[PDB]
């Protein structure tokens, strides 16, 4: 045992299928009109970026949409045990005697 004990932090990731409720008619939709723009024109490729612009809005005053974590599916985390390595994050820092 060396002179000290220690705590350990990790992280986690878990996939989840979420139930999202959205109440009625809380966004007014402003839908623009589409357009065609040509660019990146070489001798073989004539590329178009057909665009379209929308103004969205929040009509209702409070909150009108609730998300919820519902169905667990997997764990990408592995919840493994592997430490973070200051020799990688701080490559420039080093001791005196290079041997």
């Amino acid at each position: 045992h060396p002179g000290f004990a220690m705590t350990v932090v990790r992280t986690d990731e878990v996939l989840a299928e979420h139930i999202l409720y959205c109440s009625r008619a809380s966004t007014s939709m402003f839908v623009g009109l589409p357009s065609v723009v040509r660019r990146e024109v070489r001798s073989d490729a004539v590329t178009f970026e057909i665009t379209h612009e929308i103004a969205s809005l929040h009509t209702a005053l409070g909150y009108s949409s609730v998300i919820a974590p519902a169905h667990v599916a997997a764990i990408t985390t592995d919840m493994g045990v592997h430490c973070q390595d200051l020799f990688m994050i701080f490559p420039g820092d080093a001791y005196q005697d290079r041997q």
């Binding site: 932090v9 992280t11 990731e13 909150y63 998300i67 990408t76």
Partner: protein, 49 residues
């Protein structure tokens, strides 16, 4: 510092405190702004289970 209604209006939309990557080999910190979908509730309580 703020009153908590902005904390509600921040937690639903915005960036985390510099969160982690997915589908890699190690854990990297994310710089692709728009793919990653995460919500971490380790912010609001500010604790660790």
């Amino acid at each position: 510092n703020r009153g908590l209604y902005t904390l509600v209006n921040e937690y639903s939309a915005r960036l985390a405190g510099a969160p982690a990557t997915s589908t890699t080999d190690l854990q990297y910190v994310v710089v692709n702004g728009t793919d990653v979908f995460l919500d971490q509730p380790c912010h609001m309580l500010q604790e660790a289970y």
